[PDB]
Each structure stands twice: as structure tokens, then as C-alpha cells.
């Protein structure tokens, strides 16, 4: 038995729909569960389907099974960023689970009022050292990790100020060098044109 999981990485905008597609080889297989793994955490059960049934729905989740074609799929309506995780499909007849390689699902949040900006931040004791912070940018902006191995750049990351109901993207950069300041930091990344660069 091998279980194939077709999509490896899956990036989708908040609110839109997603699918993951799996196939299995061993016709004895009759139980097909799905598990998710939020980064740096354990595996949590999501939903399952058995051999009697073709379609099962639970809240925003739907699973399909076609036994004849030996394929099955997870459908997520109205993705939220909380859905971001690695999803795994599995199959079971030896009553063990055979697992697919996983699909990384990223749900990028919809930034209501973009305000792209690159700010400089000082050490609380002291000063320089300092760090450059790219923030408030739109989800469709992509941050690239620089072509100079002596300057460090984080990937984008989403935070949620739960009240007042506000989400924001952020990336951090820093070096130890002469020739590095915030004006030049995210050169190498597209970056909007209206990015605020203060003094």
C-alpha cells in the first residue's frame, strides 16, 4: 500500500475554497482519515470517511471518496488563516495507517487597509544594535531572503491583534555590517512603490 497526496504546497487567500487530492493503491483500504499538523505541534484528527459513503460534510469541511477510482479528497470552504497547517491523508485496510507526504496549506489573510512601511527599531539596551521591520504590507507581496549571506531576512508572518480585530503581515531583517540600513534592506524583494521609509 502507498497513498499519494498530489498537492505539496497550497497557498490560498482568506475566504476562498481549497482542495487536497489523494489516491490509494490497495483496494482492501476502507478507512480514510485526515490529520493536520500546525507548525511545531502534534497531529490532530480533522475528519474521516469509510467505504460505504461517497460524501461527508462537517461544518466547512467536505470529504469525497470514489472506491472504483481509488481517490479521495478534502474540500475546505471559506478558508480562514487558522486553517493554515500541514494536512495529511491516510488509508487503512495489518490495521495500520498509510500516510501521504502531506500538503502545506497557507491561508493568507485579507489586509483591509494596506500601509506598507519599513521602520528601524533600537535595542532596549543598547543601541545600535538595531533591526529593520517591513510591516502592514498586502498579502500578495512576497519577501525574498537576500543574496548577501551577512544580512538576515525572515519570511513574512501574520499576527492578529484579537481586539481590535486587526491582522498584519511583517518581516524582519538585520545585519552586523557597514553598507546596511533600512533603505536598502528589502532590496531584492518587489515591495510596493508607496512603501513609507521614514528618517
Amino acid at each position: 500500500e502507498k497513498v499519494e497526496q498530489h498537492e505539496s504546497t497550497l497557498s490560498v487567500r482568506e475566504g476562498d475554497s481549497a482542495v487536497i487530492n489523494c489516491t490509494y493503491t490497495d483496494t482492501a483500504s476502507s478507512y480514510f482519515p485526515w490529520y493536520k499538523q500546525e507548525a511545531g505541534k502534534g497531529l490532530h484528527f480533522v475528519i474521516d470517511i469509510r467505504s460505504n459513503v461517497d460524501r461527508k460534510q462537517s461544518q466547512r469541511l467536505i470529504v469525497l471518496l470514489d472506491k472504483k477510482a481509488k481517490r479521495f479528497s478534502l474540500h475546505i470552504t471559506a478558508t480562514q488563516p487558522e486553517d493554515s497547517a500541514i494536512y495529511f491523508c491516510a488509508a487503512s485496510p495489518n490495521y495500520k495507517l498509510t500516510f501521504g507526504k502531506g500538503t502545506l496549506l497557507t491561508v493568507t489573510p485579507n489586509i483591509q487597509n494596506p500601509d506598507p512601511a519599513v521602520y528601524q527599531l533600537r535595542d532596549s539596551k543598547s543601541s545600535d544594535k538595531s533591526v529593520c521591520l517591513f510591516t502592514d504590507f498586502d498579502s500578495q507581496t512576497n519577501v525574498s531572503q537576500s543574496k548577501d549571506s551577512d544580512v538576515y531576512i525572515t519570511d513574512k508572518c501574520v499576527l492578529d491583534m484579537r481586539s481590535m480585530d486587526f491582522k498584519s503581515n511583517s518581516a524582519v531583517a538585520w545585519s552586523n555590517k557597514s553598507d546596511f540600513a533600512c533603505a536598502n534592506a528589502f532590496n531584492n524583494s518587489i515591495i510596493p512603490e508607496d512603501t513609507f521609509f521614514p528618517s
Binding site: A39, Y119, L121, S124, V131, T135, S149, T154, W174
Partner: protein, 238 residues
């Protein structure tokens, strides 16, 4: 439901390691081991029902001996680890649904010589950002640590906060070329500018590092890079 100890472990080449999994509810007597490799692929190892059952099995690259000692305890010995991995204990009733425990993470090092704890620094909100957005972002930088076993958290006036926080999901390598490169991780806490501007408000990022124990030998002049917390702080300014 299911406890596994330890939750983490350092393993130099040569050392074996023992893992325990205690079942906390007798309705799910069927207990199993699954490995999850560094590429995230899960693979079943064993399922042991009765006390006294033991089995052996070899995968690339780790060798496993598993033993169901009691009706509620399952043990696993892991030896000859080339590549690191994570080990999940599962339990089940009639084998159908499988509940996965919290897992034990194993990292493998050639040398103990290259373990280091993190240095931690907090960077205070830009004034520009406070004027422009009426919001304040603290950044926390944990640098120079190895292996990548840190848990970063933010503490505001002595209580832990989750709102406003985002930590990098992946640490980045300081010298990406090297095989045993020390790591670095950033995190951000974002608050209202009014809250940052109260100087009675105290901020700390805390980095739990996981490193050597009493049982690990240590030969070098610098301090033994033991399991420890490293913190950094900042105060509100008006």
C-alpha cells in the same frame, strides 16, 4: 489521553534513547508507534496489544525495539540514529480511529561541542511607526543557538500573552553553507501605542532552550550549554 516522556531529546552518534508512553484510559488498549521523519513523512512502526509483547524493526536510519510492558505503558528504544525524527504514540479501540499523542522529538548531533544556547535581544518600537499607525511593534531576536530547540514566548507585566504575537515558524541559519550552523529566530509583539507609552508597562520575551543535561559530558572552557531560559526586556516610554 496518552502522555509521552520525554517531549524532546538530544542524541549524539552512538547513544541509544528510551521513550515511554502511558495510556490514560483503558477503553483504547491498542497502542502503536509512528515515526515522522524530517521531511514530515509518517510511517507506522508497531502495534502492541498485550503486556509482554515486544518487537524489533529497522528503518533508514534508526533501529527500534518496542515493548508493551503493562496494560497502560509502552516503551521504545531507539538506536543507531543517523538522521533525526519524531515519534508519535497512538491509541485506538476496535484498528480504526487512531488518536496521536504529543510526540517525542529526537535530534541527532555528530559532536556535543557545537551546542550553544541563544542570546536574546528586544528591539523597541519605532517612533515613526507610532506616529504613522498608532501601534507599536516590539521585535525579539534569539540568535546563535544550536540545535534548533527553542520555545519563544512573550510576557507582559508578568502574564504570558498570545494576542498580538507572531513567531517565525522556521529558524534561519546564520552560516547557511555549514552543516552544523547555529540558528536564529525572530518574534513580534504588537500593541496599541497608548499601551506602549505607559512606562508602568513591562515587556519580556523568554526563550526556553533545550540542550544538555546532567548526564551529558562537557569538556570545554565556555559554560556547559544546559537546558535553560534566556530572557530580554523593555519598558514602556512616553
Amino acid at each position: 489521553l496518552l502522555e509521552q516522556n520525554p517531549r524532546w531529546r538530544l542524541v549524539p552518534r552512538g547513544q541509544a534513547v528510551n521513550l515511554r508512553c502511558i495510556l490514560k484510559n483503558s477503553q483504547y488498549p491498542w497502542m502503536s508507534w509512528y515515526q515522522q521523519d524530517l521531511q514530515k513523512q509518517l510511517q507506522w512502526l508497531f502495534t502492541l496489544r498485550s503486556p509482554g509483547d515486544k518487537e524489533v524493526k529497522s528503518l533508514p536510519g534508526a533501529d527500534y525495539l518496542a515493548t508493551r510492558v503493562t496494560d497502560t505503558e509502552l516503551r521504545l528504544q531507539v538506536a543507531n540514529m543517523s538522521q533525526g525524527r519524531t515519534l508519535y504514540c497512538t491509541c485506538s479501540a476496535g484498528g480504526y480511529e487512531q488518536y496521536f499523542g504529543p510526540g517525542t522529538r529526537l535530534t541527532v548531533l555528530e559532536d556535543l561541542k557545537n551546542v550553544f544556547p541563544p542570546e536574546v535581544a528586544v528591539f523597541e518600537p519605532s517612533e515613526a511607526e507610532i506616529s504613522h499607525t498608532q501601534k507599536a511593534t516590539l521585535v525579539c531576536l534569539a540568535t546563535g543557538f544550536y540545535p534548533d530547540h527553542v520555545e519563544l514566548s512573550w510576557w507582559v507585566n508578568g502574564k504570558e500573552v498570545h494576542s498580538g504575537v507572531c513567531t517565525d515558524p522556521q529558524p534561519l541559519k546564520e552560516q547557511p553553507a555549514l552543516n552544523d550552523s547555529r540558528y536564529c529566530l525572530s518574534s513580534r509583539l504588537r500593541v496599541s501605542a497608548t499601551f506602549w507609552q505607559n512606562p508602568r508597562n513591562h515587556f519580556r520575551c523568554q526563550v526556553q532552550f533545550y540542550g544538555l543535561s546532567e548526564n551529558d559530558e562537557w569538556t570545554q572552557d565556555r559554560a556547559k550549554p544546559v537546558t535553560q531560559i534566556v530572557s530580554a526586556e523593555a519598558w514602556g516610554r512616553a
